[PDB]
Structures are given as C-alpha cells and as structure tokens.
C-alpha cells in the first residue's frame, strides 16, 4: 500500500520536468514578460532570432500567446500519457479505454498541475526561465483573455490546500482513472483501479498532512471543480475554433477536442 503511493510518486518524478518543489523555489530570477517588448525578447530560437525585425502588429500578440498555451499543454499531454503507462493496472486496460481516459482526463490533470507554477500575479513558463504576468493576459483580446483568467482564480484556491508533489502524484492518477467518461467500455475495472488509488491517497494525506482534517473530501471537491472548469474551457476553445479563423489547433489538441 505504501509502495503503491511511492510507485506513482516515482513515475511522477520520472515523467514531469516541472515540479511544485522546483516551481516554488523559483517563484519565491525568472525573466518577467509584462509587455509586447519583453514577450518578444523571450526567444533564443535561432530561426526566430534570424527572422525577427520589430514588434508584432496586434492580433499576432494574442495568437502568439494562444500558440504558447497550446505548446505548454501538448508537452504536458505527452508527459501525462507516459505517466499513465506506469500507473498500476492502466496498461492492462483496453487500449481504447486508455485513450478515452486520457482524452477526457488530461486537461483536468494539467490545470491541477499548473496551479503549482502559478501565483496571484502570474505564472512560470518556458522551463521556469520566464514569468508571464497576469496583467498582460488581461491585456490580450477577449476570447484569449476570458480563457486564461478563470484558471488563475481556480489555481489560487487549489494552492490554498498547500499540497506537495507526493499529493499531486496520486491526485492526478485519480483524475485520469475516472469512471464516468463517455464511451468508456470496461467501467468496473476502471472504478476498481480508482478505488485502489483513492485508498492510497486517503492514507497518504493522513501520513503527510496530520493536522489538517477534512482534506480528502476537499480534494474530491476539486475533482468536480476541475470537470466544470474543463467543461467551460472546452466550450470557449470550440467557440474560438469557430470564430478565430486565423487561428488553428495542434493535431494532438484536435483529437482531444473532437467529440466533446
Ligand atoms: C488556449 C489555452 C489556454 C489555457 C490557459 N492556460 C492554463 C493555465 C492554468 C493556470 C495559469 C495559467 C494558465 C494558462 C497558460 O498556460 N498560459 C500560458 C502558458 C505559456 C505561455 Cl508562454 C503564456 C501563457 Cl499566458 C489552457 C489551454 C489552452 O488551449 C490549449 C489546450 O486546451 O490544450
């Protein structure tokens, strides 16, 4: 049982480059991106460096941030996919279920993970090297500003729990191995596996956070909140996909948002 929680926490460490430990040690010399000038200064890309001339028109600023939001999540989706392979019993499931579980579960896992790299004034980006301000994300266009702002307000509430990476490791495994996803075939086997993980998390929270009662149902509450947050996010993404014709979506993201 204890080795179960350390197996997942092992895989978490093995698969996710950015951790809450490394994140909070940075947050408490990142290059601050607070305007169009500093946003462009974050480059280092040799091809980008060879092509840059001046500052971008206006519409390019929001598409660029929207492009960086895609890249962030795409990388994290591929990490979460490996992470899931190491979760006990996940690989024994039907490959369809494995895909279905990841399809509807990755964003919920991401937004909980991304709370680690966030505070009330902004978030860490680009391998912890830069810090994008909240004000700048308010200064973008409405469609792209209205999808970033709900996340900040959730992240600060999630960070009030004062969890660590060993808590997140199990918590994320619980989000992925979720029973009530559309089209999920072998439901009993997934719920069974989730109970094992839920039983592991219940023990871990008591062994890691002694003097903070009622913390488990709090985390269960956040799972329902992560669903509603993603439910709104996906809707705002599809409204964007409809209206924003000069905007496209990464092939990995296209899959996930196909049939939601
Ligand atoms: C357009 C889009 C926006 C966000 C919003 N994300 C999730 C999130 C959580 C907590 C704080 C800030 C955020 C925000 C985010 O990652 N922003 C972000 C990331 C990198 C850079 Cl360089 C700049 C910014 Cl503004 C998330 C997904 C997405 O679409 C891609 C996808 O759904 O996969």
Closest residue (by CA) to atom 14 of ligand 1? 148
Is the CB of residue 44 less than 8 Å from the CB of residue 205? no
CB of 61 sitting under 6 A from ligand 1: no
Residue 114's nearest CA partner among 143, 144, 153, 88 is: 153
Mutate to test the pocket of ligand 1, among 148, 248, 257 (most ligand atoms within 8 A of CB): 148
Adjacent-strand bridge partners of 133 = 122
Residue 163 lies in domain: 1-260
The Cα 104–Cα 22 span in angstroms is: 28
Closest residue (by CA) to atom 26 of ligand 1? 69
Total structural domains in the chain?
Answer: 1
Adjacent-strand bridge partners of 33 = 132
Q: How far is CA 177 from CA 97, 103, 237, in A?
A: 10, 11, 24
Farthest CA pair distance, the chain: 58
The resolution, in Å, is 3.0
Pull the structure tokens for residue 97.
Answer: 């279920």
Using CA atoms of 52, 53, 56, 61 in order, give the dihedral in degrees to the nearest 10: 20
Q: How far is the CA of 164 from the centre of ligand 1 (A)?
A: 22
CB of 131 sitting under 6 A from ligand 1: no
In a 13 Å sphere around the CA of 99, the CA atoms on its Cβ side amount to 8
CB of 112 sitting under 6 A from ligand 1: no
Q: Can you give the CATH number for the domain in which 238 is found?
A: 1.10.565.10
Residue 237's nearest CA partner among 213, 216, 211, 258 is: 258
CB of 66 sitting under 6 A from ligand 1: yes
- How was it solved? X-ray
Residue 64 neighbours by CB under 8 Å, 6+ apart: 39, 56
Q: How far is the CA of 7 from the centre of ligand 1 (A)?
A: 29
């Amino acid at each position: 049982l204890k080795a179960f929680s350390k197996h997942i926490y092992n895989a978490y460490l093995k698969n996710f480059n950015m951790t809450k430990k490394k994140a909070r040690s940075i947050l408490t010399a990142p290059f601050v991106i607070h305007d169009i000038e500093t946003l462009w200064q974050a480059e280092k890309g040799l091809v980008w460096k060879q092509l840059v001339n001046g500052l971008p028109p206006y519409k390019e600023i929001s598409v660029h941030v929207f492009y960086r939001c895609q890249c962030t999540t795409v990388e994290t989706v591929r990490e979460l996919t490996e992470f899931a392979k190491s979760i006990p019993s996940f690989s024994s499931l039907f490959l369809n279920d494995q895909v279905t579980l990841l399809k509807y579960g990755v964003h919920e896992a991401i937004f909980a993970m991304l709370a680690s790299i966030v505070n009330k004034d902004g978030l860490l980006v680009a391998n912890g090297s830069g810090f994008v301000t909240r004000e700048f994300l308010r200064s973008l266009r409405k469609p792209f500003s209205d999808i970033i702002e709900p996340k900040f307000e959730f992240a600060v509430k999630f960070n009030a729990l004062e969890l660590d990476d060993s808590d997140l490791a199990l918590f994320i495994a619980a989000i992925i191995l979720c029973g009530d996803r559309p089209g999920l075939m072998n439901v009993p086997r997934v719920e069974a596996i989730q109970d094992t993980i839920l039983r592991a998390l219940e023990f871990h929270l008591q062994a890691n956070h002694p003097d903070a009662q009622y913390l488990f149902p709090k985390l269960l509450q956040k799972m329902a909140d992560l669903r509603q947050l993603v439910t709104e996010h996906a809707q705002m993404m599809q409204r964007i996909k409809k209206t924003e014709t000069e905007t496209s979506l990464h092939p990995l993201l296209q899959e996930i948002y196909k049939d939601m």
